[PDB]
C-alpha cells in the first residue's frame, strides 16, 4: 500500500507528536515541557554532572539548543551548570521533581499503550533505538 | 529502566522528529512542507477529491487547521475546492493535474528520504510497528 495512513514514516511522526502533546499536557503541573524534562532526566541519571555535548547528541539537538534548556532548569534550581567542556549536574530538588514528572510521563504513556503487550513495546524500543542510535552512519 | 533512551515515548518523539526534519528538507525543491505535502497526498489518493474533515482526522488536526494548508495549495494551482459530483453539499479538495505531477515528485523525494531510516529494518518488524502505530493513531471499534 502506498496510502499515507499506511506509511510508517507518517505513522511514527504522527504518534511521536501525539505522545509529545500528551506528555507536555501531563507535565503542566511540573512546569517542564518535553525538552526540559529530557535534559533533567539525563542529568539525574548520574551523580556528577553529565556532559552537555552528550545530552545534545542523545536528544538529536545542537548544543546551542541545550544551552537555553539548561538556563530554564537553572532558573528553578533544578540543575547547576559546571565546567571548554560543560556538564549539567542535577540538584536534590531536580531529582525530586524528576520523579514526580516521570510518574506523569509514564501515565501519559500508559494511556496510549494500554492493551499493547510488553513484548511489542520491547521490540519497538529496540527498533527505535537502532534508528536513533546506529552503530555507524550509513 | 530510568534511562531516557529506554523511554518508548521519548524514542517515538525522537525518531518521529528525525522523520519530520528529513521530510521538510527533502521537500525543499517542491516548496511544500510536511503539512501541505500531507494534504496534497491525501487529495491525490481520491479521484474526485477528499473531504476537509477526512484530511483533518488523518493528520490528527482540527479541521480549522487545514483551511490554510488548502489555501496555500490552491494559490499554487495544486488543488481546487470543488463540490462532490455525487453530493453537492459535500465539499471536496481535489488535486489538479499539476498537483498530481508535484505529488509524484514529492513522494519520490520523501520515499527516498524515509529509506535512510527504514530500509534496513526486517519486513516483519516494520509490519508490526506499522500495525501497532495505526492502532494508536487510528483506534478501531466493535465489528
Ligand atoms: C500538532 C503537534 C503534534 C501537537 O501540538 P499541540 O497540540 O499544540 O501540543 P502542545 O505540545 O503544544 O501542547 C500539549 C497539550 O497541553 C496543553 N498545554 C500546553 N501548555 C499548557 C499550559 N501551560 N497550561 C495548560 N495546558 C497546556 C496544550 O494546549 C495541549 O492540549 P490539547 O490541545 O488538549 O492537546 C505539534 O507538536 C506539531 O505540530 N508538531 C510538528 C509536526 C506536525 O505538523 N504534526 C501534525 C500532524 S501531520 C504529521 O505529523 C505528518 C508527518 C509526516 C511524516 C512523514 C511523511 O512522509 C509525511 C507526513
Ligand atoms: C521539524 C520540527 C519537528 C518542528 O520544527 P519547525 O517545523 O521548524 O517549527 P517549530 O519550531 O515552530 O515547531 C513546530 C511544532 O513542532 C513540535 N515539535 C518539536 N519537536 C517535535 C517532535 N520530535 N515531534 C513532533 N513535533 C515536534 C514543537 O513542539 C512545535 O509545536 P507547537 O509549539 O505546538 O507548534 C523540529 O522540532 C525538529 O526538527 N525536531 C527534531 C529534533 C527533536 O525533536 N529532538 C527530540 C528532542 S527531545 C523530545 O522531543 C522529548 C520528547 C519526550 C516525549 C515523551 C517522553 O516520555 C519523554 C520525552
Ligand atoms: Cl521545540
Ligand atoms: Cl530547544
Ligand atoms: Cl478547506
Ligand atoms: Mg502547541
Ligand atoms: Mg526563561
Numbering used by the authors:
A (entry chain A): 4 to 86, 92 to 146
B (entry chain B): 4 to 146
The paper states:
The cou gene cluster includes couR, predicted to encode a MarR-family transcriptional regulator. The CouR regulon was defined by mapping CouR-binding sites to the cou promoters and demonstrating that CouR acts as a repressor. Consistent with the EMSA data, CouR did not detectably bind either p-coumarate or CoASH. Together, these data demonstrated that the effector of CouR is a p-hydroxycinnamoyl–CoA, the product of the CouL-catalyzed reaction. The CouR protomer showed the α1-α2-β1-α3-α4-β2-β3-α5-α6 secondary structure topology typical of MarR-family proteins.
To determine the molecular basis for recognition of p-coumaroyl–CoA by CouR and its potential effects on the conformation of this repressor, we determined a crystal structure of the CouR–p-coumaroyl–CoA complex to 1.52 Å resolution. The AU of the CouR–p-coumaroyl–CoA structure contained a single CouR dimer (Chains A and B) and two molecules of p-coumaroyl–CoA. The p-coumaroyl–CoA ligands bound in the central cavity formed between the two chains of the CouR dimer. The phenolic moiety of each of the ligands occupied equivalent hydrophobic pockets deep within each CouR protomer. Indeed, the phenolic hydroxyl formed hydrogen bonds with Asp10A and His117B of the different protomers. In contrast to the buried phenolic moieties, the CoA moieties of the ligands were solvent-exposed on the surface of the groove formed between the two wHTH motifs. Strikingly, the two CoA moieties adopted different configurations: one of the ligand molecules was bound in an ‘extended’ configuration along the α1 helix while the other adopted a ‘bent’ conformation with its adenyl group curved back and inserted between the pantothenyl regions of the two ligands. Despite these differences, the six phosphates of the two ligand molecules were nearly collinear, occupying the length of the groove formed between the two protomers of CouR, and were fully solvent exposed. Superposition of individual protomers of the CouR dimer (i.e., Chain A or Chain B) with a single protomer of ligand-bound CouR (Chain A) yielded RMSD values of 0.81 and 0.82 Å over 112 and 118 matching α-carbon atoms, respectively, indicating that at the level of a single chain, CouR does not undergo significant conformational change upon binding of p-coumaroyl–CoA. More significantly, the structural data combined with the functional characterization of the CouR variants strongly indicate that the anionic, bulky CoA moiety of p-hydroxycinnamoyl–CoA prevents the binding of DNA by steric occlusion and charge repulsion.
